From a paper:
Antibody 384 is our most potently neutralizing mAb with an IC50 of 2 ng/mL. Its binding mode is unlike any other SARS-CoV-2 antibody reported to date. The most highly potent mAb, 384, adopts a unique pose, with a footprint extending from the left shoulder epitope across to the neck epitope via an extended H3. 253H55L also binds to the all-down configuration (1 Fab/trimer), as does Fab 316 (3 Fabs/trimer) and Fab 384 (1 Fab/trimer). Although Fab 384, despite its high potency, predominantly binds only one RBD per trimer, analysis of different particle classes revealed some weak density decorating the other RBDs, also in the down position, whereas a subtle movement can be seen between the RBDs of different classes. At very low contour levels, and with Gaussian filtering, we are able to see slight evidence of one (right), or two (left) additional bound fabs. Loss in binding and neutralization with Fabs compared to IgG is quite modest for mAb 88, which attaches in the all-up conformation, but much more marked for mAbs that bind the all-down form of the spike (253, 316, and 384). Thus, mAb-384 showed 79-fold less virus binding and a 486-fold loss of neutralization activity when reduced to Fab, suggesting that both Fab arms are used when antibody interacts with virions and also highlights the exceptional KD of Fab-159, 2.5- to 81-fold better than the other Fabs depicted in Figure 7D and Table S7. Bivalent attachment to the down conformation may also lock all three RBDs, preventing attachment to ACE2.
Residue numbers in the entry:
A (entry chain B): 348 to 595
B (entry chain H): 1 to 228
C (entry chain L): 1 to 213
D (entry chain C): 27 to 69, 80 to 143, 165 to 172, 186 to 245, 263 to 397
Write the structure that this text describes.
């Protein structure tokens, strides 16, 4: 899809095999923010959002937090606290025509900057002068979308690039998108090194009488450490008590 | 050669549909925005429609909104006008005109400098009929000094228009092709005359070439003095 | 929508006179105005664009001026081949609206018409209808009267006429009057004639023919 | 009509379980004892502003209120969230719906989902494009007005619609009064009981006593004098002063010059006494490299300089 009408896909309730992605070498750009690729396969997420569009190489640097430009300001803006990955690859062999591929558009004028993850597909005539426009193109009255060139003989800065922006919402909640990691059996009343939906630690896992609400996944103590977890396979609440200790 | 050639005009009944074409040559057609402009018989110029350089904006006059559709094929270098739900008042000569080159932060001042030749659209319930071409033979009396008159009568045709030429275009000086008149029969009548030297009437051949494309009628009529 | 008002509607002037046509825009259109010349039954020819820029090939006696809402086309020295209708067009936006148009006539000296009469062709007579034609060639002004007479009986209601526009070279007019009769009525009479009265004629001119000659 | 919001409008700020603790959090909450507009459905379905989040509440006996519409124009020109609950089926759509002149129910889609005696409270807020829906249903025995008391709303729905929502409308079943309040970025002290249920709260900006309670992180204040905040007279309006000058800075003939100088003899131009329109620069896409140091492009248009050197 065109960058002004970037397509969003919702990924939920599936095992996410991120190995293929960072192991494939087709991608020209692969940069992650808030998390590292190596530590991604062993991590769960509440939801994953895949936003996909096409831009040119000059504008690839704008797909990042804290960036400015036509794409960042008027087409697709990422928040300053973005937690996800940006993947891009050159699609000159696919998104270019001998007469110029004019199907990919981008927004050129807008009265204000887009909020993060905002999608504007309005085609209202932009009023750039004092005279009001009555919906008709003309003098100081702009059509807000411009068409990309995209020709096989274009310079690399102007060749097409397909971009995918994976956004992760790490909020502590029931997970549906977990990595390709096999589970093990659970041992109660013993000091173990546990990993519950990507949350790791050391402690004794015991039975509890803490009535978690259907939307609650983790409990916390005053120190903000994990107090209890809900087993992702059997919906019971287990208390986590740090393994015994004391001064010597 | 930079030009616009129109096509598709003809006779249509009210309510039907007709599609006009405009072929562009000698310039990058995809860089310009195009317009349709019509002119009813005996009336002024009327702007009809507008399409952007690549068709992302389209505008129609209120008299044709909802019934007319403008479109372009930049690859075919062509402009089209699909006219549905035609009405009697839609009878007019239609022109296509290329606008200007939309550039960054500039509405083009160079626009509308190249038009088509026009095409005639007639919306009526009447049926086509080819004309009869009768000679208007020069005077048998004439004059000894010169300056006589001969011509052709293009009678009983429908719809407009007919085209009259003399000597395959080689006789243009002194020609007068009169505006057609609508006879009470519903058919048109037109006269075309030319003044020539009287000493030429025995030495020069005169033939009028009447063309009525709506009925596919081409007639070449010899105009000569009468046998006396 | 911005409206264009052209003024005057019609005007007659003389060769060499300066002609001024005004175009008034209901709202500002900057300098996005063009001037067209349209000879009768012809494709409009662009004369001025950008309110004041002369199109290539246009004679330098044409000139445009104005900005915003007031625009004036000026013909410094009117010429015989300038007889046409002139339009202004706005193009500040996609609505390329036109004005109503200004017809430019030319006043010249009086010219008497050359009068010719044409009997109906034998081929047409085979069809059962007779058309007699009276031609008035190169006269001025346009006011002229044609009176058909069939055996000195003045005819009325069975004829139609048509008048050309001003000729681009001599600024004269021409007139074609077609008298229509049935073959039976055509053969019921002998002398067919048209009497032309015009300012350029001191006395009415009559052209006649006898059926059979 | 308006009524007293008393202590309604407190919801669980996140999805973390806490118990037997007083937790201080700042979020968009319904201010305590604020005025909420009272609408009637007897013998009235206007479009209301959404601002920064909307508190909605309704009292039912026959399930007259069945849905909500959120958007800006609600006229098929933009995307508008539509929620309808018909009998046993909850339907959520974000299509560009063509709504009636007066939408009601008789007795380019990017998402679709299909599933007085009763008080049903809701909170609708949009954070970074995420439309968060909170609600709580409880039995009541009161027709005249909102019952007084405290009840926390759990989160239920989070739709990543990415729609700029500024107005909303309700949907009534025609052959049920409702209240509309507004959220503010207030700080609340939430009291979690032994079962992890929120049982009380302190609105830190309600009254000086609430300010004290928040300062001491307790619902009990001992006898004495406490310093809890600072009074500051806030400004009423902004004052913007700049030298009055209409000259445009000649950025055109510096960048778009025909010929440039060699790097060893680099040409320097002095820009002084002109209005600098930096919009063209960062808005033009001819440039391959555009990097700023010491200052940001966005904050450049609103900034003066003694001199500029090019
Ligand atoms: C979301 O929509 C609102 C209104 O529907 C926009 O706010 C308006 O912005 C214009 C500027 O173009 C102002 O002139 C109006 O006064 C604003 N209205 C209100 C009620 O504030 C808002 O800008 C839109 N969001 C974005 C990111 O464009
Ligand atoms: C998943 O774990 C649950 C335990 O709560 C078990 O009942 C279920 O059968 C398991 N499914 C598979 C496919 O192993
Ligand atoms: C609430 O409304 C009453 C009158 O309806 C008004 O006197 C009072 O000041 C209002 N309070 C607030 C906080 O809006
Ligand atoms: C509720 O409405 C949806 C769409 O408006 C419809 O598909 C669904 O069948 C309805 N429910 C019932 C019970 O009819
Ligand atoms: C829907 O999206 C398309 C983009 O493919 C756009 O052209 C159209 O105007 C939008 N709205 C409607 C009602 O189709
Ligand atoms: C917690 O729930 C139990 C029921 O298991 C109940 O007996 C107890 O009183 C509850 N405590 C609170 C503070 O709600
Ligand atoms: C730069 O100046 C040239 C004139 O030679 C002009 O054609 C071009 O459009 C100008 N470019 C910009 C960005 O102003």
């Amino acid at each position: 899809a065109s960058v002004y009408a970037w397509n969003r896909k919702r990924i939920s309730n599936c095992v996410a095999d991120y190995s293929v992605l960072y192991n494939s070498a087709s991608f020209s750009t692969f940069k992650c923010y808030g998390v590292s690729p190596t530590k991604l396969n062993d991590l769960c997420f509440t939801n994953v959002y895949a936003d996909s569009f096409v831009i040119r190489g000059d504008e690839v640097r704008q797909i990042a937090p804290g960036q400015t430009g036509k794409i960042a300001d008027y087409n697709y803006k990422l928040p300053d606290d973005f937690t996800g990955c940006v993947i891009a690859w050159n699609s000159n062999n696919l998104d270019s025509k001998v007469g110029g591929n004019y199907n990919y558009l981008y927004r050129l004028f807008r009265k204000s900057n887009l909020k993060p993850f905002e999608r504007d597909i309005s085609t209202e005539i932009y009023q750039a002068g004092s005279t009001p426009c009555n919906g008709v193109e003309g003098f100081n009255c702009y059509f807000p979308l411009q068409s990309y060139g995209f020709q096989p003989t274009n310079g690399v800065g102007y060749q097409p690039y397909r971009v995918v922006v994976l956004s992760f919402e790490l909020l502590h909640a029931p997970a549906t998108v977990c990595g390709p990691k096999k589970s093990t059996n659970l041992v109660k009343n013993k000091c173990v090194n546990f990993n519950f939906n990507g949350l790791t630690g050391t402690g004794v896992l015991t039975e509890s009488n803490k009535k978690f609400l259907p939307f609650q996944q983790f409990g916390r103590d005053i120190a903000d450490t994990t107090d209890a977890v809900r087993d992702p396979q059997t919906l019971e609440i287990l208390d986590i008590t740090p393994c015994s200790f004391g001064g010597v | 050669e930079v030009q616009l050639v129109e096509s598709g005009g003809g006779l249509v009944k009210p309510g039907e549909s007709l599609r006009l074409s405009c072929a562009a040559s000698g310039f990058t057609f995809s860089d310009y925005y195009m317009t349709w402009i019509r002119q009813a018989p005996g009336k002024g110029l009327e702007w009809v429609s507008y399409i952007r350089s690549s068709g992302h904006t389209i505008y129609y006059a209120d008299s044709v909104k909802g019934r007319f559709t403008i479109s372009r094929d930049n690859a075919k270098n062509s402009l089209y006008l699909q006219m549905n739900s035609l009405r009697v008042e839609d009878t007019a000569v239609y022109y296509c005109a290329r606008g200007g080159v939309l550039r960054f932060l500039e509405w083009p001042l160079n626009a509308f400098d190249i038009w088509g030749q026009g095409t005639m659209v007639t919306v009526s319930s009447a049926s086509t009929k080819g004309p009869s071409v009768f000679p208007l033979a020069p005077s048998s009396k004439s004059t000894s000094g010169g300056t006589a008159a001969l011509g052709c009568l293009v009678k009983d045709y429908f719809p407009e228009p007919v085209t009259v030429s003399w000597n395959s275009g080689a006789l243009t000086s002194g020609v007068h092709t009169f505006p057609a008149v609508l006879q009470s029969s519903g058919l048109y009548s037109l006269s075309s005359v030319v003044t020539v030297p009287s000493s030429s009437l025995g030495t020069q051949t005169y033939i009028c070439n009447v063309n009525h494309k709506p009925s596919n009628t081409k007639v070449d009529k010899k105009v000569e003095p009468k046998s006396c | 929508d911005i409206q264009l008002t052209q003024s005057p509607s019609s005007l007659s002037a003389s060769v060499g006179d300066r002609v001024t046509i005004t175009c008034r825009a209901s709202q500002g259109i900057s300098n996005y105005l063009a001037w067209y010349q349209q000879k009768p039954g012809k494709v409009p020819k662009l004369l001025i664009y950008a309110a004041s820029t002369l199109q290539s090939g246009v004679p330098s006696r044409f000139s445009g001026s104005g900005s915003g809402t007031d625009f004036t086309l000026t013909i410094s020295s009117l010429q015989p081949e300038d007889v046409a209708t002139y339009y202004c067009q706005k193009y500040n936006n996609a609505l390329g609206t036109f004005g109503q148009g200004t017809k430019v006539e030319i006043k010249r000296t009086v010219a008497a018409p050359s009068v010719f009469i044409f009997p109906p062709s034998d081929e047409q007579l085979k069809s059962g209808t007779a058309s007699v034609v009276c031609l008035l060639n190169n006269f001025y002004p346009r006011e002229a009267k044609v009176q058909w007479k069939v055996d000195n009986a003045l005819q009325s209601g069975n004829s139609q006429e048509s008048v050309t526009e001003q000729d681009s070279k001599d600024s004269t007019y021409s007139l074609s009057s077609t008298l229509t009769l049935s073959k039976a009525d055509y053969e019921k009479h002998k002398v067919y004639a048209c009497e032309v009265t015009h300012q350029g004629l001191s006395s009415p001119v009559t052209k006649s023919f006898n059926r059979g000659e | 009509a308006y009524t007293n919001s008393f202590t309604r409008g407190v919801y669980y700020p996140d999805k973390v379980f806490r118990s037997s603790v007083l937790h201080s959090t700042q979020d968009l909450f319904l201010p305590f004892f604020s005025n909420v507009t009272w609408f009637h459905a007897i013998h009235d379905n206007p479009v209301l502003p959404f601002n920064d989040g909307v508190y909605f509440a309704s009292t039912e006996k026959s399930n007259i209120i069945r849905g909500w519409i959120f958007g800006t124009t609600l006229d098929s020109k933009t995307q508008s969230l539509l929620i309808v609950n018909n009998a046993t089926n909850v339907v959520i759509k974000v299509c560009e719906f063509q709504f009636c002149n007066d939408p009601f129910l008789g007795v380019n889609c990017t998402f679709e989902y299909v599933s007085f005696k009763n008080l049903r409270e809701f909170v609708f807020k949009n954070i970074d494009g995420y439309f968060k829906i909170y609600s709580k249903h409880t039995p009541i025995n009161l027709v005249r007005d909102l019952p007084q008391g405290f009840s926390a709303l759990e989160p239920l729905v989070d739709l990543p619609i990415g729609i700029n929502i500024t107005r909303f409308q309700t949907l009534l079943a025609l052959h049920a009064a409702y209240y509309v309040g507004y959220l503010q970025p207030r700080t609340f002290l939430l009291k979690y009981n032994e079962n992890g249920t929120i049982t009380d709260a302190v609105d830190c900006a309600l009254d000086p006593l609430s300010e004290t309670k928040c300062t001491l992180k307790s619902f009990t204040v001992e006898k004495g004098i406490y310093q809890t905040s600072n009074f500051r007279v806030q400004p009423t309006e902004s004052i913007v002063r700049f030298p009055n000058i209409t000259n445009l800075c000649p950025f055109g003939e510096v960048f778009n010059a025909t010929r440039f100088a060699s790097v060893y003899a680099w040409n320097r131009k002095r820009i002084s006494n002109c209005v600098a329109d930096y919009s063209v620069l960062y808005n033009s896409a001819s440039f391959s490299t555009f990097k700023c140091y010491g200052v940001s492009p966005t904050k450049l248009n609103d900034l003066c300089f003694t001199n500029v050197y090019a």
